[PDB]
Amino acid sequence: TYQRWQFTLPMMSTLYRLANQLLTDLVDDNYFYLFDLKAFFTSKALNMAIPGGPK
Amino acid sequence: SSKMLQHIDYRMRCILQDGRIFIGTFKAFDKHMNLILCDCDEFRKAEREEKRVLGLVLLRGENLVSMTVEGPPPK
Amino acid sequence: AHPPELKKFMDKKLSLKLNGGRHVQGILRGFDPFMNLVIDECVEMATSGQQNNIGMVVIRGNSIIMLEALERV
Amino acid sequence: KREEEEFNTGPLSVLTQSVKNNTQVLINCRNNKKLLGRVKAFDRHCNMVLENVKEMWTEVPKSGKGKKKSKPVNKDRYISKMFLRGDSVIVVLRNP
Amino acid sequence: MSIGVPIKVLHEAEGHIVTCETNTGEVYRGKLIEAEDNMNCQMSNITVTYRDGRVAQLEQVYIRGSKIRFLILPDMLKNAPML
Amino acid sequence: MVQPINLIFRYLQNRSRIQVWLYEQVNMRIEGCIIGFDEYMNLVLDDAEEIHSKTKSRKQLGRIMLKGDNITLLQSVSN
Amino acid sequence: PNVVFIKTEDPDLPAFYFDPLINPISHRHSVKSQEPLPDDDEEFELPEFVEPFLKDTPLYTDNTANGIALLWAPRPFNLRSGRTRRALDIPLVKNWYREHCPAGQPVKVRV
Amino acid sequence: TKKFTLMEQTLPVTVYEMDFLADLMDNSELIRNVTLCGHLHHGKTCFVDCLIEQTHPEIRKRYDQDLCYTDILFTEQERGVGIKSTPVTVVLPDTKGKSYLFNIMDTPGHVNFSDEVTAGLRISDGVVLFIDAAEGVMLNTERLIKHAVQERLAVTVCINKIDRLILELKLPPTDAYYKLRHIVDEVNGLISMYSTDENLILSPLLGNVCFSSSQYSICFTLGSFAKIYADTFGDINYQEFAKRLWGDIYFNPKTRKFTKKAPTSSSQRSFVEFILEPLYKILAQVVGDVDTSLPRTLDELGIHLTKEELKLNIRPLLRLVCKKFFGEFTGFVDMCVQHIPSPKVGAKPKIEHTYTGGVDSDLGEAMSDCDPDGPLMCHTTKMYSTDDGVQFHAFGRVLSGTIHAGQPVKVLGENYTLEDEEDSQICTVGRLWISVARYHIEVNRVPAGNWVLIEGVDQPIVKTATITEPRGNEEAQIFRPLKFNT
Amino acid sequence: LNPKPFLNGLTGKPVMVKLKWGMEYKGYLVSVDGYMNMQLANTEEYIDGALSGHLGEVLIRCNNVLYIRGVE
Amino acid sequence: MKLVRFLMKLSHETVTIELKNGTQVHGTITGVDVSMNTHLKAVKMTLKNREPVQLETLSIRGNNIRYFILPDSLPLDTLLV
Ligand SMILES: Nc1nc2c(ncn2[C@@H]2O[C@H](COP(=O)(O)OP(=O)(O)OP(=O)(O)O)[C@@H](O)[C@H]2O)c(=O)[nH]1
């Protein structure tokens, strides 16, 4: 049924750097300060836009 | 241990080294046969007889001679 | 640890009450793990209240049944 | 094993030969009473397992305040087998 | 090591008011300050009953462990998380 | 600090005459000159005069060893 | 709080080492304080067999340098165990467009 | 439904009998009134959680998410910034096992909210100060040292987030030691600058600073860690050991005694060799060789985990492994118990500072004695709204006397004097509660020295108010209104 | 003269042991051990100085013993 | 050797004991411990001079004991091993 997976850490430590072209190297979530899902909701409940956000 | 442990929470009568008697509800014992008796009476002996009350008595093990059961448990 | 916490009492002026109904009064400086004391300016309190002076004395630990301060910690 | 070196050589050898010979040995308890015995084993605490025993003492209780001293003529009751806690001992003889 | 339940309840007793009777027959009644694992107590501010009747007050006292033959611990301890 | 096992050693080196009080037996004292301590405080007393204070008289003994558990004080007196 | 993780570039270096990006600790006790350090040889010695708890085992192993780095990996890579998903559900390109990409790119893609 | 707060309907299971808590409250020497303060996100709230998790067995953290227990407001949880000073009362054991009562006023760390600190500061006897090990002293840490010292509380400092050294910065032990020692020295400099007293120098040797990582439930003083050391190997005078484990004291393995001089140029310090390095080896096995050598390591530490626990993710697993090793936060207790004075002892400086009549007044003498049977004098400094928002409960310290349910009390507002009685009102006291952050225990009475929530007296009270008997203490006066930090 | 060498010295001499309970024994000692139990040979028992009898080849148990003195 | 271990093999036979303070118990025995702590069941007491008493179960501390009184129903020879 292929439901659950359990890997050792040498496996994970390899797979991570194979994937490395796709991933972004942000270590922490401070970047998205007024650029996360919650900020946009405020920009939609008011009628007023964030500069780079959606409309 | 296992014979003593059977007695726990009953109402136990102790006879001290000097001849005194205590009667108490029994909840602790130790490798030196220290005791904690609780809700306890000091009791001495028509030949006159008398009954004093004590609380939460901690008995240094050296004194103890014998102990006996006479009650069902204060449940 | 095994030593008595007698550290407080040192150089303050003690009374002792010893086994067999004996009394001595002292300025203290000793203890070891058995509570063997070394007393200084040590007065002996005889039954009749006739008092002796005696010099520095050792006490065996098991002989004590109380150790009282005549002037505070 | 090491106690055997002690019990052959030392002061406890009094007890050791008392088993082998089966001489009687006259013990003096702390309650004044004497136990005379044929010791059948022991340990370093002076614990003993005694036989053929006769426990001899004058019986003059404290109760009398002068009455009980009327009774110096003694007693001898015969206990067939008897274990004895060691610390009850003050001294011990050999009888031969 | 297995220092059992009673001596823990003794440590639990500290800072209250306990009564404490010695071999000789003197009865002490005092506020506890510290108690050691062999039951050496220190006690403060005592009202002592002598063997023959007389009362006295005392500043501070230290009572050798093996010289005791009961304490009267203050009743509220019966609830304590040792029990 | 003055440890007691140190103090008793100073009484050895002086070779002093010390007076011992016995456990329980207040009416008797021993009054010895001294060399001795295995760790139990067992003393060896050379003079060792017994002082039976009801009689006041003073009975005399050899070079005696005074077993530790009998002791209480350890007073200093003259020769 | 700013996660401060220092990416070790090459595995030759010991996993715990004062990497040059970290500002050197200027502190060295100049006005040297005389706090209550007990006197030398003041009757304290340890029993025969006490030791630092894990002294038989090395401070670091070759996996230690790599294994720390997983702790700040993105959500599927930072865990030892999970539950399998459908191939439909994994949004492979999602991380890119959630970040405000550098404006020098043409107008067309920005919108 | 208006139920915008996370209050628990039902009383959770506690390790202790609730009757035992009330009994302890009479014994004025056993209770300690601390306040935890320190700069934003230095880990105060998550530390308190580890106490609650230790104390309330049914309550456990979620693996994915912090259990911000004292953050009771949705607003407060949405922001992720603490905004209200929330009190917690728990009994938790010392190394000796002796149980003490702690009233822990968890306070915000954001600079603007500092109001909340000062109110909880007034009713407390002592500060615990939390410093992030990675960042060290920051803006609001320096402000709170200055404020506390002026208020004449005892101070003790706690160094949080030690794990950040090991896992983020990857500092080797010896340099990590220097990072700790730097923090300690800066704090000492600040205190000694403000405080005219000099006896309050704080350093790990004296017990009054402790090292903790609150994410992973690590807390240890030098005394506490040696207690772990002694209960393993046996026959160590652990208090004498704890003196020798900090600063420039080096271990000589040939003579097996400590010396102030390094026996070889590579001889690591007593701190590094005994405290830091086995801490490092615990963490670097768990986050490192969890597959290959972690079971072997756990054998030596005496820790046993089931086959279901060993499949956890690394962050839950690390918290679990340490929780078995260190156990209870007893080290924190030893620091608080010894250095922070009990209300008996603490009454005299507290009355002297806060009371306009001073200690020379008869009531001042009576309050300094902290007698539960003395004249009632209660000080309220905080107001907390009801679950519905309709009412407010006054919160305060029973600085003398005893408050009873249904008792009629005279409430003195901040402008009251013997020449102007118009700022006073007589109120009927409703229900009283001992406060714990998410559930409230109702009680019949509260004796002197403890904290209490008071219902129905809130009408005449604007901010601070003094609560006193209507017919006895006719010469009572208010306590000084709070001198805010800004 | 420490106590351990001393007791080896008195071996085989005449010695006179006095017990706490006020009895006393005269004896030619035969050994001593780690706890200072003792044996005596050809012994007399004194009780207030009465020569009670020739108690053969006694053993004494160490907690009983007060001083031991040597005889001219 | 180690006679206290002989005082555990003896279980569920019958004994008198005299304690140190002139007390006598008469009992059947179950349980004994390393420090000679005795427990008897079916217990008849006699204090010093005072009259008999009979008790269900009695537990006697080790260091108060003096002589037992074994029954003649022991063949002794088994104790050597
Ligand atoms: N690395 C590390 N992070 C922690 C630790 N403890 C808490 N944190 C994180 O630090 C952040 C701050 O925690 P809080 O305790 O809620 O913040 P605070 O210290 O109470 O300060 P306020 O928000 O003003 O109330 C949270 O994201 C925690 O997850 C820790 O021990 N180690």
Swiss-Prot record, chain F:
It is found in: Cytoplasm, Cytosol; Nucleus. It comes from the Eukaryota. Residues 5-79 form the Sm domain. Its main location: cytoplasm. SMART domains: Sm. GO terms for molecular function: RNA binding. GO terms for biological process: 7-methylguanosine cap hypermethylation; mRNA splicing, via spliceosome; spliceosomal complex assembly; spliceosomal snRNP assembly; U2-type prespliceosome assembly. InterPro entries: LSM_dom_sf, Sm, Sm_dom_euk/arc, snRNP-E. It holds the Pfam family LSM. Core component of the spliceosomal U1, U2, U4 and U5 small nuclear ribonucleoproteins (snRNPs), the building blocks of the spliceosome. Most spliceosomal snRNPs contain a common set of Sm proteins, SNRPB, SNRPD1, SNRPD2, SNRPD3, SNRPE, SNRPF and SNRPG that assemble in a heptameric protein ring on the Sm site of the small nuclear RNA to form the core snRNP. Component of the U1 snRNP. The U1 snRNP is composed of the U1 snRNA and the 7 core Sm proteins SNRPB, SNRPD1, SNRPD2, SNRPD3, SNRPE, SNRPF and SNRPG, and at least three U1 snRNP-specific proteins SNRNP70/U1-70K, SNRPA/U1-A and SNRPC/U1-C. This is Small nuclear ribonucleoprotein E. It comes from Homo sapiens (Human). The gene is SNRPE.
From Swiss-Prot, chain G:
It is found in: Nucleus; Nucleus speckle. Widely expressed. The MPN (JAB/Mov34) domain mediates interaction with TSSC4 and SNRNP200. Has structural similarity with deubiquitinating enzymes, but lacks the residues that would bind the catalytic metal ion. It is linked to Retinitis pigmentosa 13: A retinal dystrophy belonging to the group of pigmentary retinopathies. Retinitis pigmentosa is characterized by retinal pigment deposits visible on fundus examination and primary loss of rod photoreceptor cells followed by secondary loss of cone photoreceptors. Patients typically have night vision blindness and loss of midperipheral visual field. As their condition progresses, they lose their far peripheral visual field and eventually central vision as well. This is Pre-mRNA-processing-splicing factor 8. It comes from Homo sapiens. The chain holds residues 335 to 445 of 2335 of the full protein.
Curated annotation (Swiss-Prot), chain I:
Transmembrane segments: none annotated. GO terms for cellular component: catalytic step 2 spliceosome; cytosol; methylosome; nucleoplasm; nucleus; pICln-Sm protein complex; small nuclear ribonucleoprotein complex; SMN-Sm protein complex. It comes from the Eukaryota. GO terms for molecular function: RNA binding. Its main location: cytoplasm. GO terms for biological process: 7-methylguanosine cap hypermethylation; mRNA splicing, via spliceosome; RNA splicing; spliceosomal snRNP assembly; U2-type prespliceosome assembly. It is found in: Cytoplasm, Cytosol; Nucleus. Keywords: Acetylation, Cytoplasm, mRNA processing, mRNA splicing, Nucleus, Ribonucleoprotein, RNA-binding, Spliceosome. Residues 2-72 form the Sm domain. Plays a role in pre-mRNA splicing as a core component of the spliceosomal U1, U2, U4 and U5 small nuclear ribonucleoproteins (snRNPs), the building blocks of the spliceosome. Component of both the pre-catalytic spliceosome B complex and activated spliceosome C complexes. As a component of the minor spliceosome, involved in the splicing of U12-type introns in pre-mRNAs. As part of the U7 snRNP it is involved in histone 3'-end processing. Belongs to the snRNP Sm proteins family. SmF/LSm6 subfamily. This is Small nuclear ribonucleoprotein F. The lineage of its organism: Eukaryota, Metazoa, Chordata, Craniata, Vertebrata. The gene is SNRPF.
Curated annotation (Swiss-Prot), chain J:
Residues 2-74 form the Sm domain. GO terms for cellular component: catalytic step 2 spliceosome; commitment complex; cytosol; methylosome; nucleoplasm; nucleus; pICln-Sm protein complex; precatalytic spliceosome. The keyword Secreted does not apply. It is found in: Cytoplasm, Cytosol; Nucleus. Methylated on arginine residues by PRMT5 and PRMT7; probable asymmetric dimethylation which is required for assembly and biogenesis of snRNPs. Keywords: Cytoplasm, Isopeptide bond, Methylation, mRNA processing, mRNA splicing, Nucleus, Repeat, Ribonucleoprotein, Spliceosome, Ubl conjugation. The keyword Repeat applies. GO terms for molecular function: RNA binding; U1 snRNP binding. GO terms for biological process: 7-methylguanosine cap hypermethylation; mRNA splicing, via spliceosome; RNA splicing; spliceosomal complex assembly; spliceosomal snRNP assembly; U2-type prespliceosome assembly. Residues 1-80 are annotated as: Sufficient for interaction with CLNS1A. Belongs to the snRNP core protein family. Plays a role in pre-mRNA splicing as a core component of the spliceosomal U1, U2, U4 and U5 small nuclear ribonucleoproteins (snRNPs), the building blocks of the spliceosome. Component of both the pre-catalytic spliceosome B complex and activated spliceosome C complexes. As a component of the minor spliceosome, involved in the splicing of U12-type introns in pre-mRNAs. May act as a charged protein scaffold to promote snRNP assembly or strengthen snRNP-snRNP interactions through non-specific electrostatic contacts with RNA.
